[PDB]
């Protein structure tokens, strides 16, 4: 009876959410036309978590599309698995943020965030028992960062008793896609730790590393990278949609992952990934997923997990498993290399079992890890912002909309607050 | 055995009252020829409310159409569903008032109002029991305002125990269709306060944004504007002509919505307004009706109901509905935001259910609101009338036909009386 509010923002968030509902509607068995055809009766039982019933067996997702350019909105609706969306939830501006956090958060986002708050409250009050507020956006962009974080800040005041996932990508250290990203990246973090209960940190260079080294694909497009995110984003709420021998909601993960409110950044992975060359050569077993699940190559964050110390963990297993095999490997990895784990917390890893696997896959799992390695991602952005703020470069756009350098000092102070607290916990 | 007489006045009245007779003839099931072609036997149960039996089974409406210009009846007879009206009811003039209230009320009306009370009286004692009269005219014009309100005054003298509906259209807030609109609006209000038992206000810009933003049509014409004007008037009398669980006759719409005899002006809103491209995504459930019914955008008056509370509300539900969800939604909206309701009347909202829905639709509602926010429609016209009169502008046309400024001072004196007493009960 729980349902999850999925909200999409920006160029990055909209295209991923097109892929997210592409696989979920296929996993639940409803066609791109909009008629349910899932042959398994267990999928139809829990349909209200992601789909609202409509006239004639029709289902529409509990999702919004929020952007400042009609280009992404037109691109989503044009392709397949885009017709299923709500026409009313396609809120859109005409200006375009254009990689400025001042435009997204304060000036041109303000006159059209009241419209997106109208359709969210319309959708929230229609459904029965709200579980969370899951957002998929970007941190280095301008459309999904400035308007998303204000929408994150605004939605926490309206419903202060709800969890929230942030599927927010991070600018990669090795390559860059925006010149003025660390102005925008740091200024999104400052507005994030005060209101986000947890964060699902993603990046793109790990997805290229996953799709090339492990899947053996020399030319990956955004169809490949957003499918892996879409595989994860269904896997987080796997226990809600289907029966399981040990279920877990969003708050089950939330209490089991953060010792403190401010240490709420994670790293995420997806275990059952095989190349087509090694399609027939990997024996799918409970030992084989977990030896790849804890591998450093499979993480979807820029951080190296072996450098940092894990603070907590979480496991979202899917399919028909023997829970002793699930519980043994989680205990085995804690005792094989305890130097890579925390010393002052017993039972570091949390587990859960969902009885229904995804389509095609016989077994799957999703790793959620709060570690001190996320500091290595923060301080890369932190060292870039200090070198760029000391001369106030690229700041006349930012201060032109009314945002003083005092807030920039406050953003860097809170940016240094995160890297201060994770580091001395690792000692 | 309750008979309703329909009266249309002027260019606006004869054109938009034709489309009211379009939808009732389409809903009761009679062809443009005049014979019955309905599917069910429920339509023939109460035909006497609007139509007269004649030779050959033909049903002639109880409608008198009257104006000072011959151009409208050229358009009325030529249009579809135009043959059904009796030509004896087609009383017209030769001069034409030309947006002047003085010519319609005093000079060129005097040789014709004696004729129209001969036509009304012939259809008065022809039927058994007069429930009352309904009129749909214009206030910005002059051939339906001055000629109309004199008829409205005269029928109350002759038939004082019967009830009046005035579906009067007011000047739009941001745009004006005629220059001398504030004069003819305020002089019509001064007559409609003491003569009309109740009044329902329609505004064209309130129809304009509805037909564009909510109905998602790029270019609605005037026929699209008059349809929602025609749809709401059929929702007024839905409980009369058809059975239901709880019946609200038109006297109920008067005795319940009107706390004090001067405070009788309403606002109206049609509930199920979804486009062709957005209907199949929407689930046709009574929660979806009640959220649209109470929306500010759905009202067909120039007022915004967030400015002023509702003194009394109504709802004319049509179809097969579960009355528990109907009752608890009105209870919820009374409990969600008690600020937006008048506190000193408990349970402000009336509901009545008609068991048969309109054509095509299966679940519908018709909101009647005696809100105190409609004083802004009075006040904006009142400040226009004071500004025009203080330079004696456009006055030699009016006073040259038998007017003096004593009524204009008196017309303002009742105009600002309404906004003063509407604001008084809000506090």
């Amino acid at each position: 009876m729980r349902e999850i509010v999925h909200i999409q923002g920006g160029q990055c968030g909209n295209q991923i959410g097109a892929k997210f509902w592409e696989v979920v509607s296929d996993e639940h068995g409803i066609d791109p036309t909009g008629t349910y055809h899932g042959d398994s009766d267990l999928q139809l039982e829990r349909i209200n978590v992601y789909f609202n019933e409509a006239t004639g067996g029709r289902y529409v997702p509990r999702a919004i599309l929020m952007d400042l350019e009609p280009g992404t909105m037109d691109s989503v609706r044009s392709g397949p698995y885009g017709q299923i969306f709500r026409p009313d939830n396609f809120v859109f501006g005409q200006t375009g943020a254009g990689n400025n956090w001042a435009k997204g958060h304060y000036t041109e986002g303000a006159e059209l965030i009241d419209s997106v708050l109208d359709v969210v409250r319309k959708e929230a009050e229609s459904c029965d028992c709200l579980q969370g507020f899951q957002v998929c956006h970007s941190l280095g962009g301008g459309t999904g960062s400035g308007m998303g974080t204000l929408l994150i800040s605004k939605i926490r005041e309206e419903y202060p008793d709800r969890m929230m996932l942030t599927f927010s990508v991070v600018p990669s250290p090795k390559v860059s896609d925006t010149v003025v990203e660390p102005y925008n990246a740091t200024l999104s973090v400052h507005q994030l730790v005060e209101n986000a209960d947890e964060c699902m940190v993603l990046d793109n260079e790990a997805l290229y590393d996953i799709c090339f080294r492990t899947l053996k694909l020399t030319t990956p497009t955004f169809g490949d990278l957003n499918h892996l995110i879409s595989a994860v984003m269904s896997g987080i709420t796997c226990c809600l949609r289907f029966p399981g021998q040990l279920n877990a909601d969003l708050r089950k993960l939330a209490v089991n992952l953060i010792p403190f409110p401010r240490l709420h950044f994670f790293m995420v992975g997806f275990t059952p990934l095989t190349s087509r060359g090694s399609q027939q050569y990997r024996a799918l077993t409970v030992p084989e997923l977990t030896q790849q699940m804890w591998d450093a190559k499979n993480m979807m964050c820029a951080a190296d997990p072996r450098h940092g110390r894990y603070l907590t963990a979480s496991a979202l297993f899917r399919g028909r498993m023997s829970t002793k095999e699930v519980d043994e490997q989680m205990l085995n990895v804690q005792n094989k290399n305890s130097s890579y784990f925390v010393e002052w917390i017993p039972n570091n890893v949390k587990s859960s079992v969902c009885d229904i696997p995804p389509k095609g896959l016989k077994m799957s799992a999703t790793f959620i890890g709060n570690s001190t390695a996320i500091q290595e991602m923060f301080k890369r952005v932190s060292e870039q912002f200090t070198a760029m703020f000391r001369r106030k470069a690229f700041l006349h756009w930012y201060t032109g909309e009314g945002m003083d350098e005092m807030e920039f000092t406050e953003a860097e102070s809170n940016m240094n607050d995160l890297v201060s607290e994770y580091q001395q916990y690792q000692d | 055995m309750r008979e309703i007489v329909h009266i249309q006045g002027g260019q606006c009245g004869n054109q938009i009252g034709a489309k009211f007779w379009e939808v009732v003839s389409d809903e009761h099931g009679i062809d443009p020829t005049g014979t019955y072609h309905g599917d069910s036997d429920l339509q023939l149960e109460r035909i006497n409310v609007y139509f007269n039996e004649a030779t050959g089974g033909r049903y002639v409406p109880r409608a008198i159409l009257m104006d000072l210009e011959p151009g409208t009846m050229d358009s009325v007879r030529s249009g579809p569903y135009g043959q059904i009206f009796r030509p004896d009811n087609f009383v017209f003039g030769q001069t034409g008032a030309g947006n002047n209230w003085a010519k319609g009320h005093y000079t060129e009306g005097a040789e014709l109002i004696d004729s129209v009370l001969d036509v009304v009286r012939k259809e008065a004692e022809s039927c058994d029991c007069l429930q009352g009269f309904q009129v749909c005219h214009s206030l910005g014009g002059g051939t339906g305002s001055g000629m109309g309100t004199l008829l409205i005054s005269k029928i109350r003298e002759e038939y004082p125990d019967r009830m009046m509906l005035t579906f009067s259209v007011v000047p739009s807030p941001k745009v004006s269709d005629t220059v001398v609109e504030p004069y003819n609006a305020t002089l019509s209000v001064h007559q409609l306060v003491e003569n009309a038992d109740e009044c329902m206000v329609l505004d064209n810009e309130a129809l304009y944004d509805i037909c564009f933003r909510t109905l998602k049509l790029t270019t609605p014409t005037f026929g699209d504007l008059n349809h929602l004007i025609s749809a709401v008037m059929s929702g007024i009398t839905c409980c009369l002509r058809f059975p239901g669980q709880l019946n609200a006759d038109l006297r109920k719409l008067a005795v319940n919505l009107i706390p004090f005899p001067r405070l009788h002006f309403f606002m109206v809103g049609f509930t199920p307004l979804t486009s062709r491209g957005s209907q199949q995504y929407r689930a046709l459930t009574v929660p979806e009706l009640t959220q649209q019914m109470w929306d500010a955008k759905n009202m067909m008056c120039a007022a915004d109901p967030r400015h002023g509370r509702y003194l009394t509300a109504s709802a004319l539900f049509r179809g097969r509905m579960s009355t528990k969800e109907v009752d608890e939604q009105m209870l919820n909206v009374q409990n969600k935001n008690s600020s937006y309701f008048v506190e000193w009347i408990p349970n402000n909202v009336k509901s009545s259910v008609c068991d048969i829905p309109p054509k095509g639709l299966k679940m519908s509602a018709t909101f009647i609101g005696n809100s105190t926010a409609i004083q802004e429609m009075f006040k904006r016209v009142s400040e226009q009338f004071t500004a025009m009169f203080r330079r004696k502008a456009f006055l030699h046309w009016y006073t040259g036909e038998g007017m003096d400024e004593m009524e204009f001072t008196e017309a303002e004196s009742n105009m600002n009386d309404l906004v003063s007493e509407y604001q008084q009960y809000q506090d």
């Binding site: 899947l215 399609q279 799918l284 | 699209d224 979804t274």
Partner: peptide, 29 residues
């Protein structure tokens, strides 16, 4: 007005699942 009733190779997925998610047909190496 219809208020009665309505009466109305760029994506390159390249990922398929056959007991384990892989590539459909396109290329590898």
């Amino acid at each position: 007005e219809a208020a009665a009733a309505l009466s109305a190779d760029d994506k390159k997925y390249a990922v398929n699942i056959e007991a384990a998610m892989g590539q459909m047909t396109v290329k590898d190496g």
